[PDB]
Symmetry: C3
Subunit: 120 residues, 3 copies
């Protein structure tokens, strides 16, 4: 049966089943679910990927285990900035991904990422 | 193929499910993993039920998703991830309230985004992954 | 899981790869109808875009060692419901016999002329 993954600190941050980690769509939220870094896509992207990494790590994996990222943005003018930070977190062989533009849960949010990883 | 060990995916079509709006099945099952198609609050003949009622639409959607997962041999507790699509954030609270009812105990991972849906009266759509073997 | 994921980059073809393979599962990136310079081919033709996209996806899956019949799920993104029937018509040609599960939603895509984008999950022999 699935394990939930809740790093020290109606969905959980991630789940683990049969060696597959599913990380929830993650935004740049403070502890009160307010958006951090309102007008700054680079710092939002960094905060998101740091959270995702901690979920995967809590499960026993690393970012190299990520097979797929689902990226959701609100403006294509931010794509270059988001990509720049994203690449820093995946230095080796890159995951597969999509990046689509849509609406996100809070008005200041500029990016959200959900992630699938295969761990040992 | 099947005789060689690579068992093909099984399509999952619950007893009574009606004709789909496009070329897809209610769900697929391969190697113990169930992929449920994006599910909307459709009647037979693919009209949207409960036009201005996001709670009733969410309930109908999760009942359908549950039947797919049960037909495949699992339960809602096996769901690892849900992809939720909505048209209006004013409905988020209502959708969440019903959603919670269907996943008592440890909750799945999920996302929820706002986008366009295949019919104008549709307020919510959900796709689902479940590990059942 | 102990063995790292394999990237799938078919001979001849931003920080992603066309697909990954791990434990018999192929994740194909969201694929659009791009030429060699990342311009959208077939600007006002959703059918020809869809065909190009599904041929790309097929080649990724084949490079990984599978076929389209191994596809378990497709995520489809479109810009205009007026194009839904057309996209569906071409989609069906690529999955004869038991169809995958899928979703189709309307959203924004990376280039204005893109009319469809598809990402795919497949379970291949292993």
């Amino acid at each position: 049966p699935k394990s939930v993954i809740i790093p020290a600190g109606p969905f959980v941050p991630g789940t683990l089943a049969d060696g597959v980690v599913y990380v929830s769509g993650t935004l740049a939220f403070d502890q009160h679910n307010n958006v951090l870094f309102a007008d700054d896509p680079k710092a939002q992207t960094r905060h998101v990927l740091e959270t995702i990494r901690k979920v995967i790590e809590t499960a026993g994996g690393t970012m190299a285990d990520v097979t797929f990222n689902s990226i959701f943005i609100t403006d294509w003018k931010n794509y270059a900035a988001i990509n720049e930070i994203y690449a820093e977190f995946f230095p080796g062989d890159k995951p597969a991904r999509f990046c689509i533009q849509c609406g996100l849960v809070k008005p200041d949010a500029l990016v959200e990422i959900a992630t699938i990883a295969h761990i040992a």
